[PDB]
Enzyme design. Structure first.
Site, mmCIF file in Angstrom:
data_model
loop_
_atom_site.group_PDB
_atom_site.id
_atom_site.type_symbol
_atom_site.label_atom_id
_atom_site.label_comp_id
_atom_site.label_asym_id
_atom_site.label_seq_id
_atom_site.Cartn_x
_atom_site.Cartn_y
_atom_site.Cartn_z
ATOM 1 N N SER A 61 0.762 -1.272 0.000
ATOM 2 C CA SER A 61 0.000 0.000 0.000
ATOM 3 C C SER A 61 0.783 1.307 0.000
ATOM 4 O O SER A 61 0.206 2.367 -0.274
ATOM 5 C CB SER A 61 -1.090 -0.002 1.049
ATOM 6 O OG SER A 61 -2.051 -0.962 0.658
ATOM 7 N N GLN A 117 -11.063 -4.557 -0.506
ATOM 8 C CA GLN A 117 -10.544 -5.221 -1.709
ATOM 9 C C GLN A 117 -11.595 -5.331 -2.786
ATOM 10 O O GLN A 117 -12.772 -5.458 -2.505
ATOM 11 C CB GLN A 117 -10.064 -6.659 -1.453
ATOM 12 C CG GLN A 117 -9.055 -6.882 -0.318
ATOM 13 C CD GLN A 117 -7.707 -6.252 -0.548
ATOM 14 O OE1 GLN A 117 -7.291 -5.978 -1.683
ATOM 15 N NE2 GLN A 117 -7.007 -6.002 0.553
ATOM 16 N N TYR A 147 -10.882 3.018 4.306
ATOM 17 C CA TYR A 147 -9.696 2.728 3.509
ATOM 18 C C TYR A 147 -9.995 1.588 2.522
ATOM 19 O O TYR A 147 -10.543 0.534 2.906
ATOM 20 C CB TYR A 147 -8.544 2.356 4.434
ATOM 21 C CG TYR A 147 -7.227 2.092 3.774
ATOM 22 C CD1 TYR A 147 -6.864 0.803 3.377
ATOM 23 C CD2 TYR A 147 -6.306 3.128 3.570
ATOM 24 C CE1 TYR A 147 -5.606 0.545 2.809
ATOM 25 C CE2 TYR A 147 -5.058 2.878 2.993
ATOM 26 C CZ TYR A 147 -4.726 1.589 2.619
ATOM 27 O OH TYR A 147 -3.513 1.339 2.061
ATOM 28 N N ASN A 149 -8.759 -0.304 -1.339
ATOM 29 C CA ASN A 149 -8.094 -0.517 -2.643
ATOM 30 C C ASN A 149 -9.017 -0.250 -3.825
ATOM 31 O O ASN A 149 -8.576 0.293 -4.854
ATOM 32 C CB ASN A 149 -7.495 -1.927 -2.738
ATOM 33 C CG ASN A 149 -6.324 -2.133 -1.770
ATOM 34 O OD1 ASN A 149 -5.654 -1.180 -1.363
ATOM 35 N ND2 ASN A 149 -6.087 -3.375 -1.396
ATOM 36 N N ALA A 315 1.594 -3.148 3.031
ATOM 37 C CA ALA A 315 1.922 -4.571 3.195
ATOM 38 C C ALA A 315 1.439 -5.379 2.014
ATOM 39 O O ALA A 315 0.530 -4.959 1.306
ATOM 40 C CB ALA A 315 1.335 -5.131 4.466
ATOM 41 N N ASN A 340 5.640 -9.421 6.356
ATOM 42 C CA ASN A 340 4.584 -8.536 6.828
ATOM 43 C C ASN A 340 4.420 -8.664 8.338
ATOM 44 O O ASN A 340 3.964 -9.688 8.832
ATOM 45 C CB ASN A 340 3.276 -8.867 6.103
ATOM 46 C CG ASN A 340 2.089 -8.018 6.569
ATOM 47 O OD1 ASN A 340 2.239 -7.004 7.250
ATOM 48 N ND2 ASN A 340 0.904 -8.430 6.164
#
Lengths: 358, 353
Positions: A61, A117, A147, A149, A315, A340
């Site tokens: 990220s 996601q 948050y 993606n 990560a 990670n």
């Protein structure tokens, strides 16, 4: 490096690596605008290949910072406006819930609960359009930060449409090349494969899996040297020669939304310096960082504040990355690991180092 | 000048002066980053003093461009934010209508109908507080634009408060000096009076009168040379060395509000280039609904960026197109109609573009 840097880095990162069982780590500390490099362990354990200044790590990220700056650059070029409807740049996105969702919302995770996601089953261009066309918001636009993606991912894809370049070509020619990030890649070429670290998850060597919008949300790989240059460029944008890229970096550090003591930029997140370390350390825990939070608009956005802690965690399955810098102090850090490990550990370590040198 | 510049300028300005009975005029054309100067007629009719490239003219409302840039510079310094409540810098302003009125609103005439002029009675700091305290908005903040000296004027006064400097010292130190505008004045010094043109209203020699907030809203005087430098700085902000000033210029040309084809910046007003000349081409009070640009669009190089200005005896105009590296300043000592300025400016810049 000056002894004070060596001291604090060795006291901080070396035991972190031991505590977290990180196989390999590269750290850069930018102090008075100059980079210093530190390496530990192996990029590939089986081959006993050391981490070097040429080792490529998955940024995860942290890649959102590149996407934000590239978006910023497109704004400065007059190609896009953050105030424009998402549909302006994707006329095929016709479904009614998109009315009122602008590029700003996508870029800053405020569209109304686009998911963390894009589902794994979404592969093709047609799958992706279907997904967004069927998505139903949890909240009205510009009310909650979640948050995602799927949010900034779509922003990146749309930000490049007027240029007519692929996202990869725009990123390479408008961001990587002008800043001479010569070992930074969305797609690692065969010539760089020998330098590409393996990540480790549950003891097994892994690389990030392909996914829709990966390149925009989590897909960049870079070396500690390019990442140090990335920090310098974001520390001192007004020293960049390409006028639109200079502005683009500035725009990515504008404060668009506030939640608690943090402000959302494009990719970058910012707090006023000095910060309460417990706030960034605790707030970096995914149980907070990935939760929905109410946002207050900054109307109009506050231009890049030099006295800010500007940062981003990243990560992938096998990598953990962190970047933090304070423009006022010409001070920054990059921590790249091929495991990670939890966010607060990264932020705590970075705080110890930068607070010691500030 | 290159003959082509000489020719469009002369063919446009000569009839303009003739038709409008302008006593004296100075024009600068910025063309591919070089200034060209033209002057006509009288700075002072009675004393038969010609207009020269050193003649000072009252800029009138063109002064708001300096105020907008100085504000932008203060934002870039982190002294103020446009999102800050007005009361953050004037806690004495306790009346309830001020809730929700930000520095953005003041800077962009969207506070809810602040009046065009501060009353003549208003002089002292206590008078000024009383005025703003008693003012009753017709509209909620951020809904309508009403061009107002009392709005941008207060913006100017508040924007310099964190600096510690007077408005004039901040303007001098942070804008005029860095940009080498060494014959640009809020207060004309006695040594410079020989250069200060008279304005003409109904054939009588006049200078602008003192008023509260004059410095912020209409009180700057300047030469054609300094105004050409001002235009160049605004054409090419990222060429300026002082980082907050470069940023401040850039912020003054950001588009905060839209009304019709026009976008409001800080001082500057902008239209998309190419611009329909009729969309640019008097009305004592013009209330218009505004659409917020959320978030503001950063300075668009493909813009007609302009500001008209008037005092009782002077008429000024500045317009430039960043993408074409082209600009014009027209300074006259008669207040003649705005559409005549814009037409002339458009005829000239279109010919050169």
């Amino acid at each position: 490096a000056p002894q004070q840097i060596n001291d604090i880095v060795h006291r901080t990162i070396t035991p972190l690596i031991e505590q977290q069982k990180i196989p390999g780590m590269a750290v850069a500390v930018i102090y008075q605008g100059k980079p210093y490099y530190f390496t530990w362990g192996y990029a590939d354990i089986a081959k006993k290949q050391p981490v070097t200044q040429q080792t490529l790590f998955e940024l995860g990220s942290v890649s959102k910072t590149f996407t934000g700056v590239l978006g910023g650059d497109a704004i400065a070029r007059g190609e896009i406006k953050l105030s424009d409807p998402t549909t302006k740049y994707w006329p095929e996105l016709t479904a009614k819930q998109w009315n009122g969702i602008t590029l700003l919302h996508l870029a800053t995770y405020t569209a109304g609960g686009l998911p963390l996601q894009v589902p794994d089953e979404v592969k093709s261009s047609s799958d992706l359009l279907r997904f967004y066309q069927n998505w139903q918001p949890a909240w009205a636009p510009g009310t909650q930060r979640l948050y995602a993606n799927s949010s900034i991912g779509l922003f990146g894809a749309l930000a490049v449409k007027p240029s007519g370049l692929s996202f990869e070509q725009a990123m390479q020619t408008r961001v990587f090349q002008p800043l001479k990030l010569n070992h930074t890649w969305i797609n690692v070429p065969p010539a760089e494969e020998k330098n590409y670290a393996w990540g480790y998850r549950e003891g097994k060597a892994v690389h990030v899996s392909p996914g829709a919008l990966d390149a925009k949300a989590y897909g960049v790989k870079s070396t500690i040297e390019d990442m140090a240059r990335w920090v310098q460029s974001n520390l001192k944008p007004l020293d960049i020669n390409e006028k639109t890229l200079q502005q683009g970096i500035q725009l990515a550090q504008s404060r668009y939304w506030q939640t608690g003591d943090m402000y959302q930029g494009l990719g970058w997140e910012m707090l006023d310096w000095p910060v309460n370390p417990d706030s960034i350390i605790n707030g970096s825990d995914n149980k907070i960082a990935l939760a929905a939070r109410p946002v207050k608009a900054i109307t109009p956005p506050t231009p890049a504040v030099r006295a800010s802690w500007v940062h981003k965690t990243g990560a992938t399955g096998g990598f953990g990355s962190y970047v933090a810098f304070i423009p006022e102090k010409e001070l920054g850090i990059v921590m790249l690991a091929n495991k990670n490990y939890p966010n607060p550990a990264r932020v705590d370590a970075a705080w110890q180092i930068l607070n010691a040198l500030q």
